Design brief:
This is part of a larger assembly, with four copies of chain A.
Chain A: H1 2-5, H2 18-24, H3 31-49
The complex binds 2-acetamido-2-deoxy-beta-D-glucopyranose (4 copies).
């Protein structure tokens, strides 16, 4: 349940959903927010696995 | 339907999507 | 046109299938007794390669243009060197720079010239009886060349110039490519003995050269050697009896291989990483032998087919011209507010009628404004000096920005600034444009300050005297045509909006389509995006709600903006793909389990 | 002259140095930056190969571009130091150990 609920946090981005990021904004200026989201989700996965 | 005994049945009745396969 | 040829027996293109054919060295490094897994462009195993013929037999002779995608596996087979050269380029118009490679008796020439080719170029050779040699008869491949930014000539040599017939005693393979401007080539020769369709086995191709040319290539051709003799009629249109010739043409794809470097550093075997489940398990294990058991491989996913779009029925246009210099704007201190809604808008009006010099957005890419659906767009009207046009920005300072009109940091919208010098260049000067020079404290974002009292700089309470330390922050401008460009007025409009709050009808010119059910398809509901299957549910939405949500805080159910029904959303299909194998040693048949 | 069209093919010259052997030395073999003790090797490359890798995308050999020779690459020494003390209370002698 916690691993699922981690999928709705911004981690610093302007929104917590990737589709909105890729639809509202141009990818060369969206790669940074995508990187933020990827870092957050990687941290969550590592915690759960350990 | 199965071959479980009585006490096994009592024990059986007393215990209660992004890629999360089981 | 130019000279042509007759008696061309048109036939459907013969087809044949390669067998582990056309694998070249990916790069320059050296490895010994490893199993590397490279990722480059390769000819797929057991692909479909198009046969071509030029052998007269009868009346067969063909060498037409072929498209040139990202690589071609040209694998000719010859006995008397009937196929000699090549042509590259974009349209062969003698106007776009093009490449050429001829195998002449002098050299294997490489040229980069705007050559003007005819519709039937070739290489001509004749069997003169006085001297039984093979000289060129008509080297009119091209008209001339104007500009040539690259030329090269190789070493001289002398071809054997055979005029005989027989089975193709040798074999030739080439893989032409084109990356990052550079032009490459690969080759390998083997005197294989056969008479017919390409043989079995596996062999590797070695690099030859790397041309540093910068042309763009789309479509290519091929030279042939016409074996003209006395028995021919004796003309460029009908006098020719070429003889045996055969060559195939393959196409590359972004595949993924697993090559097996042997002890010497050569390549002895290769396995395609996506042909069949056993090969996938070999690729995953990084080995050529698979032990008995069950393994894991890539996942299974259903691919969407159709895309649907829904939008509310709105026809009224969005009034923009009456906001863009209708009659007059207001001063900086008292800016102008306007709310626009319930209309279909567009951005092209901000790109065609007047290309405003200052046009920079925030949060939203300027070219993407069609699709995302807006909510209660806000507009601002005011004119400032050209010196401080940068003052209007999310996170800047300045007198007017910090004292007259301040943007929030999370502002989501575009800003437009464009000079109107003729409208605001009075010889006497228009002086209704003011500013707030001083204020005791800063203001709030999107908050007005209409106070125009006598500001008290220090002590001596003013009480309407405007004495020392009592100044008037509202001061006029000096807009005259004689003023400098930096001080010239700019007209600035701020386009502010917010999104994803409630059902709005302000967004752009997209068009609707029919609605489908019970299929894994894409969708777009008032700017929403995703993928799933749309069924009909039994939820009872209260007659003010729009969305539905799960415990994971995502979209579960939506509402059709036109039919007012209630639809459902469900992911298409997940699941891994296991593979059951008895062992590569034992057999080579597998069973696949979708989980 | 121009720039940024058909990536540079007309370009300036490059310098050269000597070739030392059997000593730790930073090297630059046609752009291959590294560090180690170059020594004569016996691996047989192919006429068109320059680099050399073994199991983990690491350099193991390099072709001497001028003489078309093969030179190995062995990294320099490692190893932390260890101090064997019999106790400050007892004496003040040590015996270091290079690992
Ligand atoms: C591709 O070829 C066309 C020919 O019209 C040329 O205009 C274009 O610049 C080429 N593209 C590249 C990336 O070289
Ligand atoms: C290459 O491999 C073959 C094995 O077929 C071996 O006989 C030969 O000696 C090897 N080449 C060299 C230079 O060792
Ligand atoms: C394959 O199985 C047979 C029968 O057990 C055995 O003789 C042979 O050595 C096996 N081969 C390999 C490569 O394991
Ligand atoms: C040092 O050793 C002596 C003799 O065993 C002992 O009496 C003393 O307490 C020790 N001191 C410390 C600091 O270990």
């Amino acid at each position: 349940n916690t691993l699922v609920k981690q999928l709705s946090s911004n981690f610093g981005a302007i929104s917590s959903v990737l589709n909105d990021i890729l639809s509202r904004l141009d990818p060369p200026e969206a790669e940074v927010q995508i990187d933020r989201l990827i870092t957050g989700r990687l941290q969550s996965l590592q915690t759960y696995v350990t | 339907p199965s071959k479980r005994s009585f006490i096994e049945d009592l024990l059986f009745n007393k215990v209660t999507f992004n890629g999360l396969t089981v | 046109q130019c000279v042509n040829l007759t008696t061309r027996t048109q036939l459907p293109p013969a087809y044949t299938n390669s067998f582990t054919r056309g694998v070249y060295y990916p790069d320059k490094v050296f490895r010994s007794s490893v199993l590397h897994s490279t990722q480059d462009l390769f000819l797929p195993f057991f692909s479909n390669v198009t046969w071509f013929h030029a052998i007269h037999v009868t009346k067969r002779f063909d060498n037409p243009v072929l498209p040139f995608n990202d690589g071609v596996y040209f694998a000719s087979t010859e006995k008397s060197n009937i196929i000699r050269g090549w042509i590259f380029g974009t349209t062969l118009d003698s106007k776009t720079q093009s490449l050429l490679i001829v195998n002449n008796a002098t050299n294997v020439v490489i040229k980069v010239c705007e050559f003007q080719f005819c519709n039937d170029p070739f290489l001509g050779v004749y069997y003169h009886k006085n001297n039984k040699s093979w000289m060129e008869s008509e080297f009119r491949v091209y008209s001339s060349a104007n500009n040539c930014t690259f030329e090269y000539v190789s070493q001289p040599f002398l071809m054997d110039l055979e005029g005989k017939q027989g089975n193709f005693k040798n074999l030739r393979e080439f893989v032409f490519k084109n990356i990052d401007g550079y032009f490459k080539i690969y080759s390998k020769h083997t005197p294989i003995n056969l008479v017919r369709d390409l043989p079995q086995g596996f062999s590797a191709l070695e690099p030859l050269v790397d041309l540093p040319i910068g042309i763009n290539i789309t479509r290519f051709q091929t030279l042939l050697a016409l074996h003209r003799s006395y028995l021919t009629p004796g003309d460029s249109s009908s006098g020719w009896t070429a003889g045996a010739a055969a060559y195939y043409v393959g196409y590359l794809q972004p595949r993924t291989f697993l090559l097996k470097y042997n002890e010497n550093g050569t390549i002895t075997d290769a396995v395609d990483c996506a042909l069949d489940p056993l090969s996938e398990t070999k690729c995953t294990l990084k080995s050529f032998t698979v032990e008995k058991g069950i393994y894991q491989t890539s996942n299974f996913r259903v691919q969407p087919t159709e895309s649907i779009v829904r939008f509310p029925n709105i026809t009224n246009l969005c009034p923009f011209g009456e906001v863009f210099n209708a009659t007059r704007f207001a001063s900086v201190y008292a800016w102008n507010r306007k709310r626009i809604s319930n209309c279909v808008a567009d951005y092209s009006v901000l790109y065609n009628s007047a290309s405003f010099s200052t046009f920079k957005c925030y949060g939203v890419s300027p070219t993407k404004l069609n699709d995302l659906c807006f909510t209660n767009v806000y507009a601002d009207s005011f004119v400032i000096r050209g010196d401080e046009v940068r003052q209007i920005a999310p996170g800047q300072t300045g007198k007017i920005a910090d004292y007259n009109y301040k943007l929030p940091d999370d502002f989501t919208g575009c800003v437009i600034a464009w000079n109107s010098n003729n409208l605001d260049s009075k010889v006497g000067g228009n002086y209704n444009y003011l500013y707030r020079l001083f204020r005791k404290s800063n203001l709030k974002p999107f908050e007005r300050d209409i106070s125009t009292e006598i500001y008290q700089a220090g002590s001596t309470p003013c009480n309407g005297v405007e004495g020392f330390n009592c100044y008037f922050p509202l001061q006029s401008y000096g807009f005259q045509p004689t003023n400098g460009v930096g001080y010239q007025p700019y007209r600035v409009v701020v386009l502010s909006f917010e999104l994803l709050h409630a059902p709005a009808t302000v967004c752009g010119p997209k068009k609707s389509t029919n609605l489908v059910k019970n299929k894994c398809v894409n969708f777009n509901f008032n700017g929403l995006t995703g993928t799933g299957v749309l069924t009909e549910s039994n939820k009872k939405f209260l007659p003010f709600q729009q969305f539905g949500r799960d415990i994971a805080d995502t979209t579960d159910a939506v509402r059709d903006p036109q039919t007012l029904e209630i639809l459902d959303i469900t992911p298409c299909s997940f699941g891994g793909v296991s593979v059951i194998t008895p062992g590569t040693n034992t057999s080579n048949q597998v069973a696949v389990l979708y989980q």
